[PDB]
Enzyme design. Sequence first.
Site, PDB file in Angstrom:
ATOM      1  CG  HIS E 200      -1.993  -0.985   1.194  1.00 11.27           C
ATOM      2  ND1 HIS E 200      -2.701  -1.341   2.319  1.00 11.27           N
ATOM      3  CD2 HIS E 200      -2.502  -1.717   0.176  1.00 11.27           C
ATOM      4  CE1 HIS E 200      -3.593  -2.259   1.998  1.00 11.27           C
ATOM      5  NE2 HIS E 200      -3.496  -2.502   0.703  1.00 11.27           N
ATOM      6  CB  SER E 204      -0.804  -1.118  -7.181  1.00 12.67           C
ATOM      7  OG  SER E 204      -0.843  -2.271  -8.000  1.00 12.67           O
ATOM      8  CE  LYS E 226      -9.147  -6.561 -13.897  1.00 14.44           C
ATOM      9  NZ  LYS E 226      -9.638  -6.947 -15.238  1.00 14.44           N
ATOM     10  CG  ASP E 227      -9.887  -8.184  -8.140  1.00 16.08           C
ATOM     11  OD1 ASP E 227      -9.510  -8.268  -9.326  1.00 16.08           O
ATOM     12  OD2 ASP E 227      -9.249  -7.560  -7.270  1.00 16.08           O
ATOM     13  CD  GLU E 270       3.791 -33.620  -3.672  1.00 16.77           C
ATOM     14  OE1 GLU E 270       4.175 -34.806  -3.761  1.00 16.77           O
ATOM     15  OE2 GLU E 270       4.244 -32.825  -2.823  1.00 16.77           O
TER      16      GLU E 270
HETATM   17  C1  HEM Z   1      -1.577 -16.025  -1.105  1.00 13.95           C
HETATM   18  C2  HEM Z   1      -0.615 -15.262  -0.556  1.00 13.95           C
HETATM   19  C3  HEM Z   1      -0.328 -13.924  -1.177  1.00 13.95           C
HETATM   20  C4  HEM Z   1      -1.105 -12.781  -1.110  1.00 13.95           C
HETATM   21  C5  HEM Z   1      -2.417 -12.584  -0.392  1.00 13.95           C
HETATM   22  C6  HEM Z   1      -0.329 -11.831  -1.818  1.00 13.95           C
HETATM   23  C7  HEM Z   1      -0.936 -10.388  -2.074  1.00 13.95           C
HETATM   24  C8  HEM Z   1      -0.835 -11.089  -3.679  1.00 13.95           C
HETATM   25  C9  HEM Z   1      -1.819 -10.138  -4.059  1.00 13.95           C
HETATM   26  C10 HEM Z   1      -3.166  -9.896  -3.414  1.00 13.95           C
HETATM   27  C11 HEM Z   1      -1.030  -9.168  -4.764  1.00 13.95           C
HETATM   28  C12 HEM Z   1      -1.449  -7.757  -5.095  1.00 13.95           C
HETATM   29  C13 HEM Z   1      -1.931  -7.634  -6.521  1.00 13.95           C
HETATM   30  C14 HEM Z   1      -3.372  -8.068  -6.696  1.00 13.95           C
HETATM   31  O1  HEM Z   1      -3.723  -9.243  -6.426  1.00 13.95           O
HETATM   32  O2  HEM Z   1      -4.227  -7.253  -7.127  1.00 13.95           O
HETATM   33  C15 HEM Z   1       0.283  -9.713  -4.796  1.00 13.95           C
HETATM   34  C16 HEM Z   1       0.764  -8.403  -3.752  1.00 13.95           C
HETATM   35  C17 HEM Z   1       2.175  -8.826  -4.349  1.00 13.95           C
HETATM   36  N1  HEM Z   1       2.609 -10.024  -4.234  1.00 13.95           N
HETATM   37 FE1  HEM Z   1       1.985 -11.499  -3.412  1.00 13.95          FE
HETATM   38  N2  HEM Z   1       0.763 -12.251  -2.352  1.00 13.95           N
HETATM   39  C18 HEM Z   1       0.771 -13.550  -1.965  1.00 13.95           C
HETATM   40  C19 HEM Z   1       1.975 -14.695  -2.290  1.00 13.95           C
HETATM   41  C20 HEM Z   1       3.202 -14.003  -3.250  1.00 13.95           C
HETATM   42  C21 HEM Z   1       4.334 -14.727  -3.681  1.00 13.95           C
HETATM   43  C22 HEM Z   1       4.660 -16.165  -3.388  1.00 13.95           C
HETATM   44  C23 HEM Z   1       5.093 -13.817  -4.444  1.00 13.95           C
HETATM   45  C24 HEM Z   1       6.409 -14.019  -5.156  1.00 13.95           C
HETATM   46  C25 HEM Z   1       7.521 -13.433  -4.672  1.00 13.95           C
HETATM   47  C26 HEM Z   1       4.334 -12.641  -4.387  1.00 13.95           C
HETATM   48  C27 HEM Z   1       4.865 -11.242  -5.184  1.00 13.95           C
HETATM   49  C28 HEM Z   1       3.745  -9.977  -4.952  1.00 13.95           C
HETATM   50  C29 HEM Z   1       4.017  -8.747  -5.534  1.00 13.95           C
HETATM   51  C30 HEM Z   1       5.230  -8.416  -6.361  1.00 13.95           C
HETATM   52  C31 HEM Z   1       2.944  -7.958  -5.165  1.00 13.95           C
HETATM   53  C32 HEM Z   1       2.686  -6.513  -5.501  1.00 13.95           C
HETATM   54  C33 HEM Z   1       1.514  -6.348  -6.440  1.00 13.95           C
HETATM   55  C34 HEM Z   1       1.931  -5.717  -7.740  1.00 13.95           C
HETATM   56  O3  HEM Z   1       2.893  -4.910  -7.750  1.00 13.95           O
HETATM   57  O4  HEM Z   1       1.330  -6.001  -8.804  1.00 13.95           O
HETATM   58  N3  HEM Z   1       3.177 -12.765  -3.725  1.00 13.95           N
HETATM   59  N4  HEM Z   1       0.378 -11.000  -4.327  1.00 13.95           N
END
Ligand code: HEM
Lengths: 51, 79, 62, 164, 378, 378, 241, 55
Positions: E200, E204, E226-227, E270
């Site tokens: 935040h 983004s 959208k989501d 798996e």
């Molecule tokens: C299920 C657990 C996770 C959640 C809830 C989470 C939050 C998710 C979600 C909600 C976004 C924001 C973009 C969107 O969905 O609209 C993204 C935030 C972010 N996450 Fe995670 N994340 C998770 C696991 C990971 C993993 C394993 C990586 C790899 C390193 C990762 C890299 C990012 C990045 C780079 C953002 C920033 C959003 C952006 O700049 O587009 N996330 N992911």
Amino acid sequence: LSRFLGPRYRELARNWIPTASMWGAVGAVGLVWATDWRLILDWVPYINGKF
Amino acid sequence: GREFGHLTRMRHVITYSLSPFEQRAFPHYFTKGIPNVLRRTRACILRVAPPFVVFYLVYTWGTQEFEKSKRKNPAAYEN
Amino acid sequence: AAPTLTARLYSLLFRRTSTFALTIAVGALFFERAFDQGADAIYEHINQGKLWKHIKHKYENK
Amino acid sequence: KGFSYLITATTTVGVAYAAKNAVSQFVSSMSASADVLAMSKIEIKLSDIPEGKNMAFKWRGKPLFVRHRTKKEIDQEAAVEVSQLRDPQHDLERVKKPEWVILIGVCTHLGCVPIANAGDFGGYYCPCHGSHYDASGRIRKGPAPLNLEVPTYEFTSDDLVIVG
Amino acid sequence: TNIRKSHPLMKIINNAFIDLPAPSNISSWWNFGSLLGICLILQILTGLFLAMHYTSDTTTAFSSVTHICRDVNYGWVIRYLHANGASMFFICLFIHVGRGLYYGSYMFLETWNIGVVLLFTVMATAFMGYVLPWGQMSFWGATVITNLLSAIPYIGTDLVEWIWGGFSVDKATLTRFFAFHFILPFIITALAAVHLLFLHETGSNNPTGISSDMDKIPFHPYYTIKDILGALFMMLILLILVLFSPDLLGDPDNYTPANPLNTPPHIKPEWYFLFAYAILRSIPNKLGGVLALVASILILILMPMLHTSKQRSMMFRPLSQCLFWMLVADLITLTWIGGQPVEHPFIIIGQLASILYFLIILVLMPITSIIENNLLKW
Amino acid sequence: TNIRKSHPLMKIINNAFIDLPAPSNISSWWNFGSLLGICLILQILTGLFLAMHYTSDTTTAFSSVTHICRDVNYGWVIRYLHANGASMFFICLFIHVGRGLYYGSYMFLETWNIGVVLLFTVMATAFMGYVLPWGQMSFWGATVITNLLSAIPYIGTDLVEWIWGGFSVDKATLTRFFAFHFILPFIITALAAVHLLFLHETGSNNPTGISSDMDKIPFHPYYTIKDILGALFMMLILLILVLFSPDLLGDPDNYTPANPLNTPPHIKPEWYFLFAYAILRSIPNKLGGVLALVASILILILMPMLHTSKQRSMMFRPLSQCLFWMLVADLITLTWIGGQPVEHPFIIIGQLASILYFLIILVLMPITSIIENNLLKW
Amino acid sequence: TDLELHAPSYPWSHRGLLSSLDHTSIRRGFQVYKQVCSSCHSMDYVAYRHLVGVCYTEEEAKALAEEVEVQDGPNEDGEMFMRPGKLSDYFPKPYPNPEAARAANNGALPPDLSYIVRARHGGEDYVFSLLTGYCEPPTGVSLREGLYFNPYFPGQAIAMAPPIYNEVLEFDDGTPATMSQVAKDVCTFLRWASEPEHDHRKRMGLKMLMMMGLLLPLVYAMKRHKWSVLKSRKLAYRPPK
Amino acid sequence: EMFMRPGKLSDYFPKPYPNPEAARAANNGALPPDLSYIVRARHGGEDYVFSLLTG
Ligand code: HEM
Ligand SMILES: CCCCCCCCCCCCCCCCC[C@@H](O)O[C@H](CO[C@H](O)CCCCCCCCCCCCCCC)COP(=O)(O)OCC[N+](C)(C)C
Ligand code: HEC
Ligand code: HEM
Ligand code: HEM
Ligand code: HEM
Ligand code: FES
């Protein structure tokens, strides 16, 4: 606590009653729809999920 | 915070919208998009296809080849 | 032109949110039974004879 | 506005119905399981025991004192005067076949289960409070004013008894 | 007066999910992270309803699983939903990593690293939950994979002895895994909240890659619906893959009860681990296979330092995007090689696939990024 | 360029304990809450390893608890710590609630409401963890308290049936209470963090009842040390309570395996329920004792509303104090009755105890404060 | 190092994505289980529950369950005796211990019916395949005396003697018992035992597709509805100078 | 499947009866309590259980 009392408040509740009462009816019938409540389903000509 | 009330400088750029209700949801939604889809397609198929086709080819390559090292053995092991 | 039945139908249930929720509720109540039994009789109808409910007759009421 | 609101309303209905579906699924899961379902209302052992003995067939996990009471024990029911009872209950209404009876082991208070084949009345004796019971297991002494529960049951097939 | 700005908690949600500024030009790829956020809770409740029957005993567990699949009222749906749904979790998760790597959302360093730790956590939860169902693959798989740490010259063989709680897989080791498996997901939630909390306060990413601070747009009117649509369509993928393809997703063999005695023909791990496991075939010395195994996930950290091309993304650069697709293809390679029973051609293909899998990013990407910079005064 | 302040990752903590202002005047009583927090963390780490070896159906149950008690390394150590960690956690708790009712820190709004929510959640937590040992206490205790939910004329009996997972008190039901007990505390730590989140900007409180807005103190140098010292005292009283007399405060006097026919002379839980349980004994018919069962605890929300003093701290309203300590006497009286099986002399003491409660909180104190509103001529 | 033979896929009636198993061949295959299929192997996970809804009324399900009787446990003394046969009872215990089967079968325990479809690659079609796979050995390949050569077995030589034969078991239905059709009844019945919920599951699955189809366009229409404001918009730039 | 061995040191102390109902026969309807925790299983204590047998 006495503030709730008032000349507009009487008129005001009088005004808000249709909207919130409607919700109760909507909430009640919908809740019957959600629990699939029995005895009223007896009274519906169409939706008898029972044979 | 970083909320809208104070952000980047921006000036005499102007917006023209419409009320959603006043306009129909699908303005030529078909005919406009297809050439777009197809142009994006011809744009990136050039950069997407070859890893996958090379992969498929190596797939049947190793599967069929090793299979030839596999089913065909009794002749390969001779009498 | 003259308003569509849909048009006056807006001025009815849609514009007021309580009545809107209401028609959502009655609409759910009808969509439930009708679609449910539709899926019933149709599923009964497609791959017919695989069903034992019609094959209950080998063993029911003697 | 009637058009697009018609859209939103229809979406809301299909989603609400779908929600009643999946939530119904998730509540249905916890509610029971097929093995306990088969456990339910099934214990077909009428006359498993000689008359006058008190058998304890399990049901809802809880032991249930079934008994082929002797007719003399129905006479034991008849002998004590009906109003002597805190809860005037002649046995015949309390059982389908008078020679038969069933009782929950639970008492209204702690729930403690009185011993079978031990009772000054010719029936039960209740250590937890000193309540004494005849062949009916009928309430006599307190603290509990009411009878031990006698859940409805049917002898579906004649010897294949089915409580429930 | 203001209601959302009244209550401080509401102030927080309004700083976020109610109306955080967002880029407008976002596509579905960004919808995928939100899809992860969708899957997570679903697995949690699903696993809760499953946790209403499953036992962690060496003996009594499998019978309780059979209690699930046959006794429970629609619980079979739940069983497959937890399984296949986890599969979907990894599905979306992989796309998500691909996105963050592709549009360079890894430029948000701390957010990125929390994503990494979150990734390892998900891997562990995966493995252990996979051990739980208690069957042939469960047993021999857990045994074999656990054995890997014994590659350590001193500590690791000791350490396996410590996990198992005994000489071998047993109610000790099984209950161990049941508990770790349970405790981690809740950890994953907090890491998620922390993760978004890093997100935040940097803003983004946008599909363009170039900043869209000037074009920031309200969240609630737009991206929420959208989501919602995106989650509903994933719900389609999942429900169609469960009501119409109940079994295929996994590895039958677990369907056999485990025997320390009886030993399965092939013990394929798996599918999400298959590329990882393929790397176990990669080189002589089990030690180095473990090293490269951990390195396969660890290597991601190098990239933000390895990154040097002027894009914050990878869509206006089909050049490096091509190296990218070569790398993705390489992952497909390690995948399918990991799927097959071990063989020599598979061995050499796995070798070069692994070397190139490291070198595209340790050699090709940075330096081609440099020449790409040379071409247009970057 | 402070690593603390500027860097977001830890800023909330700077908002929190590192540098939140706090009143210069604070007794041990405000340290008790933090003590309760530490006790909660300990309950997590202890219950966790318990689960690391504990497992049960109907069959595995007490044999496995004894697996802990002997067969597990240090298993008696942990289970004894945990069983005595409960009532000690309450030693922090009802005292914190008591002081909370006293100094009028419930002039703060939502902190109070959510604090009460944490109270119920911990109640059901201990009750639903209490059936884990599956001692005869666990069986009949769970049976009775589950039977309490039959008070609803319609849905409640079925809800009993529905928590049961069926008709009887079964392995399924213990599994329910297992996973529920095994998850619910995480909800507790969440709501607790939220409770502090209500507390933040509101500031704290002082014994005096006058805001020390002019005189607040940084937390870290001082209140932290006071916290740690408190931690040493709580840990001391706990370790003495258990290492020397594990079955003192601990009263599971049914190591007898649960049986459908077996029934211990006293179907009663530990004291923390019993003073409330005694309320059932007072009024005839379970229903009114159910309404009392909830509302006697639920009425704490009404306390901020019925407050009528012009001043925080009851230290300056002696009559209401006397009535308050008399309430202490009434509740301890309910505990001592709670150890006493239903009897006539204790029936009279029963209704007298109930009515004493009612008049002590609901009516008397505010009237007293009115009387000194006259004496102070407010 | 030698290959297992790879069973070709066959077009069974239920393999249609809309297709359901019929209760028919499952019933007749159940008659195949009632007698010949007690060589054991196993089905202990599944009791005479499930059998009620597929083909058998309650009293007839119980009637079906008294056909054989597993031991009642000891009571107040009175240990070990035989309960007549409620449906709540399980299928007969294959052996007091499997080890007895191993003595009965050269140490190779005959597997439970319940997962054999689900566990084996090639599944039910494979089970139908191995039943009918008893080809003769070619010259020069060794075999154990108890073994009865069959390529579909991975070790090429299953210990099992072909339980099936022409006219294995006349059905109560009176329908003819060719080894083919009776084996098809077998594996159909197995697939039933393999997936008891299957026929019911398809109905739920089909119903969901309609729901999804209706939902997929409408919600999408609302997305277009709320994003139309952004898609439509025109912007302009007019410098002050 | 059934046979006899000395039983290594690891084993539990032997069951008085193959089945509990045998103990509900030897005393008729009253199987004796497990002894390992029976002191800790009763209100009172070691003095109580000893008291129970004291007279
Ligand atoms: C299920 C657990 C996770 C959640 C809830 C989470 C939050 C998710 C979600 C909600 C976004 C924001 C973009 C969107 O969905 O609209 C993204 C935030 C972010 N996450 Fe995670 N994340 C998770 C696991 C990971 C993993 C394993 C990586 C790899 C390193 C990762 C890299 C990012 C990045 C780079 C953002 C920033 C959003 C952006 O700049 O587009 N996330 N992911
Ligand atoms: C779950 C239930 C638990 C119940 C009980 C809880 C008990 C909590 C106990 C922990 C609370 C903290 C203890 C209080 C310690 C007092 C502070 C002491 O440590 O001094 C600090 C010093 O701490 C260290 O300096 C911190 C940095 C150094 C850390 C290096 C670690 C060295 C040993 C670690 C061994 C780990 C081995 C691992 C091998 C793999 C500085 O604080 P301060 O009171 O102002 O002292 C002023 C004097 N000065 C001038 C010297 C500073
Ligand atoms: C010869 C005694 C015997 C006969 C008759 C018999 N079973 Fe078997 N069956 C076995 C044994 C033992 C095996 C496995 C032998 C081996 O794998 O070496 C087996 C193997 C099988 C297999 C495949 C197992 C595998 O590993 O491929 C199927 C399918 C099968 N039998 C079906 C049946 C069924 C169902 C029955 C009814 C119980 C039956 N046959 C009759 C004992 C028997
Ligand atoms: C995303 C993180 C999680 C993963 C990867 C994971 C592993 C998933 C998956 C893969 C299944 C296995 C089903 C199978 O293999 O047949 C299930 C294993 C299991 N998980 Fe988790 N789990 C996760 C979070 C949870 C949570 C939060 C709970 C409880 C609330 C839970 C309870 C179970 C149970 C009981 C099993 C074994 C089920 C079986 O025997 O089939 N899981 N979950
Ligand atoms: C894990 C559980 C809880 C935590 C972490 C928590 C926070 C605790 C602690 C740490 C304090 C902060 C005040 C201080 O540090 O001196 C107190 C905040 C407060 N809690 Fe809770 N609480 C918890 C459960 C409850 C319960 C059950 C109640 C009663 C219903 C309650 C009533 C209060 C009040 C009134 C305050 C503010 C005190 C002040 O003015 O300083 N708390 N308690
Ligand atoms: C503050 C919250 C908790 C309390 C008061 C507590 C004590 C509860 C309850 C009341 C008992 C049985 C009675 C007793 O020994 O005190 C059970 C003890 C136990 N708890 Fe906890 N527990 C708590 C949180 C947990 C958690 C989070 C887990 C799992 C991670 C857990 C696993 C157990 C086990 C296995 C026992 C029985 C073993 C023994 O200590 O003798 N508990 N739970
Ligand atoms: S205990 Fe209820 S009557 Fe004796």
